């Protein structure tokens, strides 16, 4: 099928992220060789989730994203049945053992304003925290509480803009921006 996107994705993200993105995609009946924009996004969203969890303290976060659907919900339940938080309706990306809340991480090519309202209206889980980033460098978190310190968040932002430049250097960014 031979997509420039697909070769760029494989040279741009580390193999562990690429393998994991393929699982979720196939597990949801999507094709990384055909749905190449979504493939690029899932990797990106995956790497952000991973840097995010790296920002905290040793035992701070439980990583929900990157597991398979059944096991992701298994840990979700174990978390709810031991802390007592309400079981979310939709799969979150993380759990903060420090603040005792679930995190939903979104990565957008539009206004951080737009995505967040979209995610807040779908959630209505109240307790679940929302933290979104954009490819231009803005972030936006519930109650203005950004969980991590500035430097951990600054790096994520830097990485997201590197991915943008690399995508645009290959004339792929325009098509990627119109994907979301």
């Amino acid at each position: 099928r031979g997509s420039h996107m697909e070769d760029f994705v494989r040279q741009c993200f580390n193999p562990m992220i690429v393998e994991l993105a393929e699982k979720a995609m196939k597990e949801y009946g999507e094709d990384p060789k055909i749905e190449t924009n979504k493939f690029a996004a899932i990797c990106t969203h995956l790497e952000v989730c991973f840097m995010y969890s790296d920002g905290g303290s040793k035992h701070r976060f439980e990583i929900i994203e990157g597991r398979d659907r059944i096991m992701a919900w298994t840990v979700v339940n174990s978390i709810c049945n031991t802390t007592g938080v309400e079981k979310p309706k939709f799969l979150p990306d993380l759990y903060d053992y420090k603040e005792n809340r679930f995190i939903e991480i979104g990565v957008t090519r539009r206004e951080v304003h737009i995505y967040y309202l979209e995610k807040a209206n779908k959630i209505k889980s109240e307790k679940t925290h929302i933290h979104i980033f954009s490819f231009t460098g803005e972030e936006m978190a519930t109650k203005a509480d950004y969980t991590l310190d500035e430097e951990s968040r600054a790096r994520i932002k830097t990485r997201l803009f590197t991915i943008r430049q690399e995508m645009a250097s290959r004339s792929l960014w325009d098509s990627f921006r119109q994907s979301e």
Copy 2:
């Protein structure tokens, strides 16, 4: 002999925990292929001990559990002969170099209330600290002093409930609960 428990134990715990559990069992004349509930427990108790020691600071804990009987007592003695704590009658699981006390870690399928009294009456070592967890998510430590911060203990609790769900998903939990 072919026990569902035994295959689940080997897929659920990491190889280092499984090897170590087998040593202790054989070293005490028990068979992991036949005593599969106890095999599952020893692994679990082993993993809890290991996460527990991971919760502290770099040099905080000496790990007694997981060594062979003779060497476990050797370090126990070295600890007593250098700090001056009373030599316990029964093998503890850890030593806290911060609070200067031995830790006994128990993992229960009953009320944290029941196990602790059972362990306190057998101990009578006074100095030795007791910290027990349950598979439903409660903990219970001497003098309400839980040694680790909440997040390290929360993770242990989460893991213990994942093991429960996985065991029950395979219809093994009922037999495991009636083992203790």
Copy 3:
């Protein structure tokens, strides 16, 4: 979902075989947590293919099985366009650079007689070689030409009978035999 088969499969085959079997299954819309007999088979068929290719000389075989559909056909075509053999209708498992032919490897719980006729009638590619094994220890190859020497084939047979005993030790063999 918790299948004894599924835990046995993961403890019985090496991780590389299990990962690869899952790809092919998901890539063909099958579930290893639900289609556990087929999961066990695909692993077995995979390990046989791998030992088989290990039997020859250094550069003897090209391994078609275990690649993804698109790439498996890519090498198939490269092989046909460089040797000149007829392009098979169905994906083979190997290519013999020594005898210059494609190999179809089957693994059966029935008479080696039955499977081979089934595979010969579906093939009709004439050139493609067929080599089947059973779980009881018989083999059966086109033109009585068994490609490998006796010892390489003897080991495959031994392994196949170990898998049978292990499956039956866990009361899984009866259900597995009725799967084919």
Copy 4:
């Protein structure tokens, strides 16, 4: 307990051999810290078995020794049920896929004459091949058929004499010789 033998055994054999010897010993209710001569022997017998299997061609031997009792018999049965050799009464050490026979490897501190008769009278399996070595450098195989070529057997002999010198250098050989 502190045995010179036990420290010498651990410095003289590689960790994989030492771990494996401990399994078999514990699995048969023997103590390597107390039965140190037998501990030294089992390691030696283990290393000989391993070099022996290394002497053949790639797929020549199946290694029975070093597995646990139940799994060693499992492969034994798979071998018998696929070749058709008679199932031995006693666990052999190897299987020769080339000559299609089981091998019993013995290592002696007495006359190769004595041990072999002892092993032949106990066996009576007829088909099972016997190949014994001594610490002084002699060997002795059924039907004068020594399976491996001279060089592979010469190395085993050399190693066995190195172990003797090292043991005697530490004044352990005399007690070891009187063990058998």
Copy 5:
């Protein structure tokens, strides 16, 4: 600069080949980000050289290609000053210790006829052997002496056609063919 070729090259060849190709290119004042066809070729020519040397016996070939200019000539000289072959004017790719000759390996997108005459007229070293391959599957060696056995050469040919299909699947083959 963002070349589809360049991303495909990095996903198609192993990292060791890509690193080595970059050295030679930079060492000769060429840019892999700009001269992407030549970048793709040098990798290909590199991988062929490496499989080629893998075809012989253990100590058969000395690999000249892939070293830096100064060190490649150093070994060339050591080879000439110890065997007595004439020192080539141009850097060869290999040395055959079996046939005692230097090998020049070429990889072409034109007729194996054309490239070979081009390489023979430039060489005039007489002793130096020439062995060329094409992307369609033909080979062509001096004195019809192809050095390796058929299977080693068949694999090279297969790989070369896989690279062609992958390049064309991405609409890169047409531009690559017009590069040579």
Copy 6:
């Protein structure tokens, strides 16, 4: 060409530093076999940059030095487009996510006074921080703000003096000092 410097450089710095220095040199049309003093310097400057970034907290610094020109500027831009700092005219060595500034690291064989003025006059980027070290042990940073704590800086200084002694032990220091 055989330079004592070049052999000393390869035995004195770790392979990762040596490889990276060669890239930058070749990427700028310099020869490490001929420009051996500059080769020694680039390694040194590289190791200082690396220890420097190791001094901070986990996510403190982004390392600009050691990347290739195009990618170094890519991250530079991502940093500027996400924080809003002015885009430097010249490539810096690091970015401090804590103090939000770019760092220029210089290593001198002259007065820390001289180099700094030279670097300040060329920079005029105002925002970019300057931190220089000498081989005799002095440092010198903008606004007397030395970013790292004393111990991290003390180690760099120690290492720089070890390199001096080693160079002089080989009678290479005099020529190296006259290089700058």
Copy 7:
């Protein structure tokens, strides 16, 4: 030569410590196969030095012990020429970048009182800090300043008593105690 000590030393300390101890011994014309008590001591003193440096913060200590004589003095000089501390007459074991002083670590089988006076009278370097430990569990540091926190020092003490028990379990302790 075959010393029980020598086999115990090799099973008791990790290979890196044993290799390093042998260097220093040979570099000073001592034989670990003959001077086995001193061999045991140098390992012990080495492991203490290593745990000690592990107690501090990331960049706290420079490790002098374990290097070869010439290189140990090279770093010593670099440290003196960059901080300005007086160059010790005798090789210390460490440097504290936090407190800016050299550390001499001694390990004794006598009264911590005796060794320290012996080391203080030989030193007279004033600035160099002295910190000694005993095999019974006492420590003793200059100005009652023990550099590390209690837990790091407690572990060293525990380890030292384990080595004592292991040595005595093998009837080697009595001869070791009379060595010092």
Copy 8:
């Protein structure tokens, strides 16, 4: 001390050869930092011995060189006490299990004629085989029996001439040639 030779030796031979050469030198009271020509030779002689043993079949040679004096003689004795060859007076470099003889490998900067007579007159062990090489490319073995096939010996010769060129490129060869 800083010898160009010593830096060249460390960049020219692999770390395992350099470590091993240092052992033998220190074990014989020689200094690689001062006796740099002998240091270069011992490495060279070591690498030749290692390639030599690599030339044979899997179990062909026992490597005597590179062990410590006591252990080298231990294997020598084990070889003699199991084959029955005469115990050499001087330590050989190898044992050929194929031809049943000890090998003395010499590497010369003079006529292969001179060295061999020197080694034959000192030996007088009759049975011990002698095989010498020169840096110009000639070899010379007892009874014109060169043990290995031409290609294995050709590579050794090539390597020896590379070392010569590298040494001379650094103006070290002249001093090295006058060392022998």
